[PDB]
Design a protein around this ligand. Sequence first.
Ligand SMILES: C[C@@H]1COCCN1C1=N[C@H]2N(CC[C@@H](C(F)(F)F)N2Cc2cncc(Cl)c2)C(=O)C1
Length: 553
Amino acid sequence: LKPNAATRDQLNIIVSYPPTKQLTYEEQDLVWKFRYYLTNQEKALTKFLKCVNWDLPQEAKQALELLGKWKPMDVEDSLELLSSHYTNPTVRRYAVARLRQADDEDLLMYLLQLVQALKYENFDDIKNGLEPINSAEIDSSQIITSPLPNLEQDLCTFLISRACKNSTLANYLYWYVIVECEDQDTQQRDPKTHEMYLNVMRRFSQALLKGDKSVRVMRSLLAAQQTFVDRLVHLMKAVQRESGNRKKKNERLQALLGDNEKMNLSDVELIPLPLEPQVKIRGIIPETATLFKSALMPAQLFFKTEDGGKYPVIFKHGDDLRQDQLILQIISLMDKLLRKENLDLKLTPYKVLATSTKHGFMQFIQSVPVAEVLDTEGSIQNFFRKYAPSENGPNGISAEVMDTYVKSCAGYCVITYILGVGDRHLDNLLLTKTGKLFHIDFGYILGRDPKPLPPPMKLNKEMVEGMGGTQSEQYQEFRKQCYTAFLHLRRYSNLILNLFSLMVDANIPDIALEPDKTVKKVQDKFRLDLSDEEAVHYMQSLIDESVHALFAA
Ligand SMILES: C[C@@H]1COCCN1C1=N[C@H]2N(CC[C@@H](C(F)(F)F)N2Cc2cncc(Cl)c2)C(=O)C1
């Protein structure tokens, strides 16, 4: 029953191993023996469930008795029980029971991954949920637009249940499920999975229709959004087909946008913007809409908002926004995590929402790429002097602007390092007149890069020069903020890792390459082998080596 002191210490070693580390057969044999003692340790549960062979009915049965008797697990820990690693129905109900304890604010932080977790759920239990054919004959983008006249819930039931009580959650659940239906690789390689997402959508549609006055209206709005996107897509196809230069294309873009009788995109009743449903839109301003220099022909569009505002967006048609959608979702979570630890590092986690595997939205943040900053003002400090001057301020620039700059440089240095962001150049490093420095274009992630031998630390001459060099007080503050952000993010390793673990079968280019090796790629950047004091030095070493190497050119 109770182990000795030396054994109690041996078990403690195991309980606090990283998630990618595999327990040995004898290691598990020990944990299995003292499973009743381990009951008082919530962090032991994870290690315990890794000892069970769910193909052995009595072992599974034995384990589930202990699950009900175990110390209730964390909401961050419950995300591990929804991964592909656990498919036993009761285990997955336990995970959901722990999510029933979370706020919608947190549920929203994990919803991208939760929608993905439906792939490991029971497809029949989801089908038998439909109250009273070829799957290709059922258009996903037509379900909501064609309305017909303790451990009780599974994941599907739960997500819909909460989506009816909350309009924001419903908007994302809808679009996250819409893109999972629209996935052509899933349709072709796993037809039974594609059928499931359709059944989740029909269940959601049905659930709304059975709801009250406010719930029933959510279904109309969702259908109004679908319809708007559908028409924006048709407008895009048209402009991309239009023969001529960018000038002739923009003429056609604004021409069609101006034609509300034909297109219905310039004047509409207030509908939640798919990208940020907290924002209601009146339609697109035609005259301000144009195409970017890019060969894809993406469009910058100005949405008239509920309160006279103008919300710029990038609408890409002919591209998959899911990888950028994941990266921006992680940067947002990491920013929220740092703020929770009272460390606001002036980050720019703009919104990205793929509305299909072929099209999506992006929240446009007014800025100038550092490339252009140099092409016109010659330096980051010259640019900041122009738009943000102060006589008493450091290097003849405002304190707030200088402070925001150092803070975001440090924030992004750590995040881009942890997420292993490749293809870094001055075209995708953006700067704001408030001092906000941020990265865009997440086409190369988790150590992937177009060029061979990419550096682990994405830092350059211009960035350091903008700080007033290596001997500045600012440079010292930069270092201090890097290693602080790092220790804070390392604290939330389990969560960042469990979420990435739920993206292995998501069809994210750079995750698909090595799904098995993905979690470890991230897990290694945290350097969980090192103590906080060691980590601080490891970070300072990265910075030194990086800076020395960049001046050596
Ligand atoms: C929404 C965010 C944040 O706000 C800023 C823009 N932005 C992005 N811009 C972007 N891009 C891919 C390349 C091109 C595009 F989309 F046209 F194909 N550019 C335009 C672009 C490129 N370089 C500088 C600027 Cl300001 C603008 C992004 O993945 C994100």
